[PDB]
Ligand binder design. Structure first.
Ligand SMILES: NC(=O)C1=CN([C@@H]2O[C@H](COP(=O)(O)OP(=O)(O)OC[C@H]3O[C@@H](n4cnc5c(N)ncnc54)[C@H](OP(=O)(O)O)[C@@H]3O)[C@@H](O)[C@H]2O)C=CC1
Ligand SMILES: NC(=O)C1=CN([C@@H]2O[C@H](COP(=O)(O)OP(=O)(O)OC[C@H]3O[C@@H](n4cnc5c(N)ncnc54)[C@H](OP(=O)(O)O)[C@@H]3O)[C@@H](O)[C@H]2O)C=CC1
Ligand SMILES: NC(=O)C1=CN([C@@H]2O[C@H](COP(=O)(O)OP(=O)(O)OC[C@H]3O[C@@H](n4cnc5c(N)ncnc54)[C@H](OP(=O)(O)O)[C@@H]3O)[C@@H](O)[C@H]2O)C=CC1
Ligand SMILES: NC(=O)C1=CN([C@@H]2O[C@H](COP(=O)(O)OP(=O)(O)OC[C@H]3O[C@@H](n4cnc5c(N)ncnc54)[C@H](OP(=O)(O)O)[C@@H]3O)[C@@H](O)[C@H]2O)C=CC1
Ligand SMILES: Nc1nc2ccc(C(=O)NCCc3cccc(Br)c3)cc2s1
Ligand SMILES: Nc1nc2ccc(C(=O)NCCc3cccc(Br)c3)cc2s1
Ligand SMILES: Nc1nc2ccc(C(=O)NCCc3cccc(Br)c3)cc2s1
Lengths: 243, 250, 251, 248
């Protein structure tokens, strides 16, 4: 029928905006959630009321664990079950908090910050490609501030750098299969705050979630059919600003 | 009225595809050319038949000299003269040829053409664009292969690297005026006219995504996106349109 | 007294070359190893025969697990127990093998080994090195010049080396106030795999612009020596490629 | 036979520290200068006092023009005439001032692009054409991706120099000439800058809250020209105390 997209952490904030905009563009969507069932279903309700049976929810914890692989397989599968196909994977879900070097157990911090930020994308990518004319692509939510990191955010920063590596390695490896792999790297978007707004060259404010979603839409579209291994910054110039 | 765009080197190939698609999107266009008089006039005819009074040509050499600033000022002025505004500048015109370090143009001319067209003219057009100032934006045609350059293309590569610096510096400085500055970086696209065919296929086979070069239209698509209302928070960004080519090791 | 360095995976190859050159420069060294027990003890013996009580060994698996923190803590502790100080940490140990996306070991074991050795262990060692400080302190991470032009089907390895770049920057930033510098050395092609045939070796050699040959272990060690030296006292968050130009060559 | 090095803008500041350290290392040096004749000669006299006939001066404007090629060939020539060889080229000379988008503009172009990029390229061509541990070191800028406001031409020139470093490394590698860069962050601050302004900059540097000494920069240069960097080409070492890692 129409194409189908998986968006991880799609309940709230940036993932919800991505899900909505993909829907508005005529995708059927899987709304993945971990904790936010109420929010996920509510979003699903709003989209199905717009177009019948075009949105489903999918629960999974994306912490790294012996079961992460099974969870990731399940997320992809639920797209194939619901819609008979899977055209787009958006790796949006992400944990974010400090992990000081001069100081949750550390290994929980690893499991969340590397697991959800990098390992789950890699596993989802594997399942997506394993289960594959069409316009197949993956979009990873990266970070424009990766080379100028927040103090005491090493594991977070490590996970986002790993996600860049995944974007590049997967683009190279899946290109022969017609699967494109790209990234979108926000700066300051939806915040945890004017201190940070004032720093942004373009308009002294944060990106809306929808601005982020815009770039995703571009990358999934037929207007990006030659684009793979690209990461588009969406940061209003913040990463250009020196100390 | 409809917004207006300048596209440098717009008579042929990628610049032509960019002028077309901007036009098809509702822009009035200035078609800058240097030598390609016929092709320039032909394209402006084609666009004007489609919507009258939406296309002009403007002739200018973009080689570095003491009069390059006046030429660049003139390109921008031509947009204001024809359309009363200038919303979009596309820095597309480019000289490209080998300049080996170890050895019929002088080196002073090679510098003038490769650094002038690829970098200095962009800078001067940017200044003139900004001084004469909705959804204002500049798009520089960069090069996805700038960190893995062709052998013996040092001056070309230097110019393209300078264009990256321009993209970042002007993005930062023009942001408070609401002008966004971004780039599109092709890998291998429309292959040179004076090139073989076993040799075109050599380059084609290296491209991971589909073992082929980009169409001009595919490059133009990325330009359209960056000027569009969908890229309003995007500045200082360079989008590679290279089908994975820059990711491939030797 | 003499400064002391920990070098991970120092029994053979590049890690041995680094331990040896640090030793010749006047450092006491901890030779970490995992499986190469014979080669590690042989090296310590050699170094001790040159100046006694200047080399120890230290065994640890650097695979990710709930005990990796303790093992990384123990590596650093081994240096303080032998030498009374720890001045330099070289994160050299590395697992390296294909993990094709389109399909030995389970995937969770591949994650544990490639991400564990290449990134998580460096992070935990960095944390232990910093916390146990209580002079010229620095950390050197062995990165990869080819991280942005990766080998086909090495996604997990590439992810781990990219994470190590992030650690290098993040830790340089966070530890600079403590006087600890953090930098990286990024080989291109160096000591080829012991497994690889000569035919394949020469294919890779011919791609190197500077001399059509791989880096010697010594050449890699040379850059590490620079970064720990007083000649690099203002250098932090820098990653020096030692690749003969390989990363500049297009496809 | 002692090796020989050309250092551009060697009269003062960083280029002076580079020439001195190369000399201390055993090199004979051509001290290139533009305006600072007295400082250049005074350096040559000091070095020649240390070791007779090991230092000469060479005056040249590195602004872009129809004669820049000739000038750069003559700089390289002076090293061969003086010392019979040229082992090392250090592209250090640089103009630096703002060029806001909103002197004539073409003079700004000629000065900022000429000294920072064109003259390096022409010197590199002349160096290689006249040709063992041969290498070139370009003085780049650690902050090129986080530029000062209204420094576009300066920034463009320094990005061009990165391109040169990479392109020339690749192309000269077959002749055994290595090409590398050193990218300072904040080093010697202007003499005239008020201490209170210097301190705003110093405060931003993670490693020690101070600017690099000229000697710290020269140390990296010494490494890259040494036998300890024999496999290193196309590399750019930041010497910035972590400055480029600091967000807005
Ligand atoms: N926001 C910004 O300004 C910035 C954004 N980014 C990137 O943008 C993306 C989206 O950002 P934003 O919307 O703010 O993200 P959030 O931090 O709000 O998290 C997004 C969603 O991720 C899910 N998630 C978190 N941890 C886990 C876990 N362990 N297992 C499963 N799901 C989990 C949650 O779903 P649930 O609620 O259902 O539990 C959560 O709502 C991220 O990838 C982020 O790194 C980059 C830089 C800055
Ligand atoms: N084609 C490709 O594969 C790739 C292209 N690019 C970049 O994309 C852009 C467009 O590519 P492409 O269409 O191939 O470009 P072309 O090589 O076809 O050149 C574009 C135009 O630049 C103009 N130009 C050349 N020299 C001068 C000069 N001295 N003064 C004024 N104009 C001049 C010419 O105009 P006229 O004919 O009127 O004289 C020419 O048609 C360029 O910036 C290029 O560097 C990036 C990498 C790959
Ligand atoms: N060789 C090259 O061409 C290149 C090297 N590099 C990097 O340079 C560094 C050194 O390279 P090289 O000497 O070839 O490295 P090797 O592949 O030879 O590995 C070095 C050591 O890592 C240790 N190691 C492996 N897995 C584990 C583990 N699970 N737990 C603990 N230790 C482990 C081994 O110790 P043991 O033998 O005791 O079990 C091994 O001797 C690495 O970080 C590498 O990625 C980068 C690019 C190219
Ligand atoms: N200082 C710092 O903090 C930083 C420095 N750098 C880079 O480090 C290098 C050395 O820095 P620094 O010592 O501060 O440099 P300066 O700004 O002090 O300039 C060095 C020399 O360049 C020469 N020069 C300037 N314009 C010309 C010209 N038209 N023709 C010929 N020579 C010219 C001058 O020679 P004369 O006096 O004889 O006329 C001058 O003494 C430069 O390339 C610079 O960009 C980069 C990052 C920051
Ligand atoms: N004005 C112009 N600029 C450029 C820039 C690049 C090219 C081109 O053909 N680039 C291909 C470079 C390349 C480099 C390595 C592998 C492969 Br296949 C292709 C062609 C042009 S035309
Ligand atoms: N622990 C280890 N890590 C690594 C990492 C890389 C290599 C290696 O041989 N890399 C070379 C890959 C490559 C990529 C492109 C051109 C060429 Br000639 C060679 C070998 C090892 S062993
Ligand atoms: N020829 C010359 N080139 C340059 C280049 C840069 C500088 C300089 O002062 N750079 C520091 C810029 C900077 C930017 C942000 C924070 C901090 Br403290 C310092 C000084 C000079 S002098």
């Amino acid at each position: 029928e129409a194409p189908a997209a998986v968006v991880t952490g799609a309940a709230k904030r940036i993932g919800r905006a991505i899900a909505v905009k993909l829907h508005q563009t005529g995708y059927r969507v899987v709304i993945h959630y971990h904790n936010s069932a109420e929010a996920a279903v509510s979003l699903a309700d709003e989209l199905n009321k717009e177009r019948s049976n075009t949105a489903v929810v999918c629960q999974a914890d994306l912490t790294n664990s012996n079961v992460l692989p099974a969870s990731c397989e399940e997320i992809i599968n639920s797209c194939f079950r619901a819609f008979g196909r899977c055209d787009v994977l958006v790796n949006n879900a992400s944990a974010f908090y400090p992990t000081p070097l001069v100081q949750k157990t550390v290994e929980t911090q690893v499991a969340e910050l590397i697991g959800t930020n990098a390992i789950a994308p890699f596993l989802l990518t594997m399942s997506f490609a394993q289960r594959q004319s069409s316009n197949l692509s993956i979009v990873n939510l990266c970070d424009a501030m990766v080379d100028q990191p927040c103090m005491a955010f090493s594991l977070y920063n490590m996970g986002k750098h790993a996600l860049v590596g995944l974007t590049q390695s997967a683009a190279l490896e899946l290109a022969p299969y017609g699967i494109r792999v790209n990234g979108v790297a926000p700066g300051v978007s939806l915040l945890p705050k004017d201190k940070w707004r004032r720093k942004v060259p373009l308009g002294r404010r944060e990106a809306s979630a929808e601005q982020i979603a815009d770039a995703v839409i571009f990358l999934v579209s037929g207007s990006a059919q030659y684009i793979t291994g690209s990461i588009i910054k969406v940061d209003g110039g913040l990463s250009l600003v020196h100390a």
